[PDB]
Amino acid sequence: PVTVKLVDSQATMETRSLFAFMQEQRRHSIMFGHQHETTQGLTITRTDGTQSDTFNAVGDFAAVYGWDTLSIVAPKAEGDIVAQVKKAYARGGIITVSSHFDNPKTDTQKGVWPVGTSWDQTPAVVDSLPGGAYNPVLNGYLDQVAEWANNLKDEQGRLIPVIFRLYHENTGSWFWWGDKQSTPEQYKQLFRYSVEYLRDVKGVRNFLYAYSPNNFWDVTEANYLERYPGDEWVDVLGFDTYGPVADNADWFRNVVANAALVARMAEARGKIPVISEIGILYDNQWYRKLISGLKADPDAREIAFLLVWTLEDFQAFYADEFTAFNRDIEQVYQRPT
């Protein structure tokens, strides 16, 4: 038995166990995650959740399965993922979903990309908080996320835990919830309001909440804290980083530095540190550089997982003793808390 302190104090036993699992596991390995693991790939023949490019490359699925709200909120352009999530959970996999919400202020104007999508930079934070004219639009997205979460059940009728990552890459201005679109306080309010709405207004009990700004080039706790929603509102501390295919030594050092920072903060705050999104012509030493850099650092090695969004390189990463794929993780959801 271990005691866990989550954002949702009434979270299900399996959700609590998932958090406890990562707390233990994170100092013994780094789980491999992949966005659209069993629903998109260059080598798969079925998108039913039974195949993955990862499995075809190394003989096992990723341990962490990433999906986003383009599979949950209308119009669900990426299609539903309930069945694929259930298949992944049945294998003992871990599920994470990131919000990719349309712009609440302009979503009825869709036609010419990127109008009305996440990529429509029209500031929409101020007008979507309570009091704002587009608060009902944002609430409609959150209603759909909650209904989906509330009915996401396994074969015994129990809820499937999900690591829900809200308003990522918020320290850049390419999304409507970005740093040119809101003051730090307004962004914190958007995050907090959304968590509160899901947890308290809609009763979601199977979510862990993740925060994930971009990598910082000035790697300080003060910089990460500027738009941080707060320890009462975040369970998972991550970050997103995309680098160059060539001459990337500096970028890899920055990956390690940001992972070390969130790892140290996570230990101080009782959170789970992760690399929420990492990605990039080809670099056939990319994965070897990634795992070697991370595991050599005493803080960065403590991240629970890294999620990616050349075959020999990846096979070496899989063979590394510190990486963990789906069959390498056990007893994730029935740990006593």
Q: What is the spatial distance between Cα 252 and Cα 39, in angstroms, rounded to a whole number?
A: 29
The answer to whether 199 and 236 are in contact (CB under 8 A) is no
Could you tell me the maximum CA-CA distance found in the chain, to the nearest angstrom?
55
Nearest to 272 by CA among 92, 66, 64, 21: 21
Q: What is the spatial distance between Cα 226 and Cα 255, in angstroms, rounded to a whole number?
A: 19
Q: Write down the catalytic residue from 14, 37, 169, 302.
A: 169
Length, in residues, of the chain: 337
Q: Which residues pair with 236 in a beta bridge?
A: 210, 272
Q: Write down the catalytic residue from 14, 37, 277, 302.
A: 277
Helix (H) or strand (E) holding 64: strand 64-68
Q: Which of 8, 68, 102, 107 binds Zn ion (CB under 5 A)?
A: 68
Q: Report, in Å, the least distance between residue 68 CB and Zn ion.
A: 4
Nearer to Zn ion, 68 or 235 (CB): 68
Binding string, 25-64, against Zn ion, x = CB under 5 A?
Answer: ----------------------------------------
Q: What is the spatial distance between Cα 269 and Cα 235, in angstroms, rounded to a whole number?
A: 9
Interface region with Zn ion, contact rule CB under 5 A, candidates 51-59, 103-111, 168-176, 316-324: 168-176
Catalytic site residue 277?
yes
Binding string, 262-301, against Zn ion, x = CB under 5 A?
Answer: ---------------x------------------------
Q: Report, in Å, the least distance between residue 315 CB and Zn ion.
A: 26
The answer to whether 330 and 90 are in contact (CB under 8 A) is no
The answer to whether 125 and 167 are in contact (CB under 8 A) is no
Interface region with Zn ion, contact rule CB under 5 A, candidates 45-53, 131-139, 173-181, 288-296: 173-181
Nearer to Zn ion, 53 or 179 (CB): 179
Count of residues interacting with Zn ion (CB under 5 A)? 6
Residue 119 annotated as lining a ligand binding site: yes
Catalytic site residue 169?
yes
The answer to whether 177 and 187 are in contact (CB under 8 A) is yes
Q: Which of 120, 240, 297, 302 binds Zn ion (CB under 5 A)?
A: 240
Nearest to 276 by CA among 165, 170, 167: 165
Nearest to 319 by CA among 50, 56, 59: 59
Which residue's C-beta sits nearest to Zn ion?
168
Q: Which residues are catalytic?
A: 169, 277
Annotated binding site for substrate: 78, 100, 119, 174, 242, 309
Annotated binding site, which residues? 78, 100, 119, 174, 242, 309
Which residues are near Zn ion by CB under 5 A? 68, 70, 168, 179, 240, 277
